[PDB]
């Protein structure tokens, strides 16, 4: 319908290279672009022969990323560096989305999930970062360390819930960990003040069927003009938060609230790519592909 034309997304097919962080920076736009172009069925007018090429690129990225999978199944920029909670969760997120495009080894995905569960979850459900990434610009609105417990917990929990189908039978501790993280988010949701954290934790809670009552009312009334979730700061953070919130609304099946949000997102005319664009590029187009998939 209101699909973003494939030509405006040409620049998102990127050859990945670099170390454990830069390689993911290169992998993100290609994966999400193939995802969106598959969902919108634009490969015919854009060029079918190109798709295979992009797939190779994705595979390249995947293969290269395995050179930074530490024996613990965790990830860091270099194998000599302490593993990052955020980077491991983001690898899980990207690979869980990519399982439909290329062959993703369930061993790697579920090992990373198990490492997150056994090493980085606190006794009250909080996920903690002990070695932050070097590319602080690839983590989006997480770079603002305010409300970092809630925001990082929501991020890691979203990663866990997107890998649940692949890893459920392999990781026996996964549902309990998801439940603990959801308990923490639900207990501390109403005290949130950032629209970004509200949006991301609301997506995490809506995936669980826990965004309800006053929590749902706070999530909905946090939007500005009923079409965007924004905070004072970088506009890319607002784009990413609104993408998370659109995914939350889609999970809630509140199709009466969606049209203005998708309208605002399309009016932003953001086509991804560039320095500091990882989270925004991934999330806005994951959300728009999910909108094209569902929606009456």
């Amino acid at each position: 319908s209101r699909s973003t034309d494939a030509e405006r997304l040409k620049h998102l097919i990127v050859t990945p290279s670099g170390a454990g962080e830069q390689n993911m920076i290169g992998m993100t736009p290609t994966v999400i672009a193939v995802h969106y172009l598959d969902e919108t069925e634009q490969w015919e007018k854009f060029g079918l022969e190109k798709r295979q090429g992009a797939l190779e690129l994705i595979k390249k990225g995947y293969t290269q990323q395995l050179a930074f999978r530490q024996p613990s199944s965790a990830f860091a920029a270099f194998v000599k560096r302490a593993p990052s909670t955020w980077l491991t969760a983001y690898v899980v997120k990207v690979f869980s989305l990519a399982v439909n495009l290329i062959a993703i080894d369930s061993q790697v995905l579920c090992g990373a999930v198990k490492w997150l569960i056994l090493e980085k979850q606190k006794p009250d459900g909080v996920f903690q970062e002990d070695a932050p990434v070097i590319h602080q610009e690839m983590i989006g609105g997480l770079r603002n360390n305010n409300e970092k417990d809630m925001a990082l917990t929501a991020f890691v929990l979203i990663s866990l819930q997107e890998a649940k189908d692949i890893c459920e039978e392999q990781v026996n501790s996964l549902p309990g960990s998801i439940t603990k993280a959801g308990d923490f988010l639900e207990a501390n949701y109403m005290n949130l003040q950032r629209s970004y954290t509200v949006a991301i934790a609301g997506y995490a809670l809506a995936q669980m069927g826990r965004l309800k009552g006053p929590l749902l009312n706070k999530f909905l009334t946090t939007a500005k003009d009923k079409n965007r979730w924004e905070d004072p700061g970088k506009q890319l953070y607002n784009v990413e938060a609104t993408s998370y919130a659109l995914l939350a609304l889609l999970q809630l099946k509140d199709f009466d609230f969606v049209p203005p949000v998708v309208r605002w997102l399309n009016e932003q005319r953001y086509y991804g790519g560039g320095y500091g664009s990882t989270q925004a590029t991934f999330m806005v187009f994951q959300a728009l592909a999910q909108y094209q998939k569902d929606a009456p």
Partner: protein, 124 residues
């Protein structure tokens, strides 16, 4: 010669390897507990004639929340943080909140044991 099925589950713990449905006799797996939970007993179990040896236990830590302290009118003595994580066997020291005095109470230096911590209390 009997083979074993999947190894048993333990609360707040999991095996460190790729889970299988069939294990040969003599095979072994190892467990790991979640962060701050303590591994009690042999972390390795072995398959023998269709049966796994007893798996280890994950002894619980203690989450010292501000809510229970406010209930008892207490706070952390040394550090000023409002939430503490304590491994089992760890010792946590408390003081009365400003304007409060100790009642008849357990020691303000209290030990966390398997998710259990006996809090002190102040009044006035």
């Amino acid at each position: 010669a009997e083979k074993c099925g999947p190894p048993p589950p333990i609360d707040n713990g999991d095996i460190t390897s790729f889970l299988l449905s069939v294990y040969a006799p003599g095979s072994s797996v190892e467990y790991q507990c979640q962060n701050l939970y303590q591994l009690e007993g042999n972390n390795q179990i072995t398959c023998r004639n269709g049966q796994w040896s007893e798996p280890p236990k994950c002894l619980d830590p203690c989450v010292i929340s501000q809510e229970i302290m406010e209930k008892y009118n207490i706070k952390l003595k040394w550090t000023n943080q409002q939430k503490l994580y304590s491994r089992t066997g760890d010792i946590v020291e408390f003081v009365c909140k400003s304007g409060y005095h100790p009642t008849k109470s357990h020691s303000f230096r209290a030990m966390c044991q398997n998710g259990k911590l006996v809090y002190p209390s102040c009044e006035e």
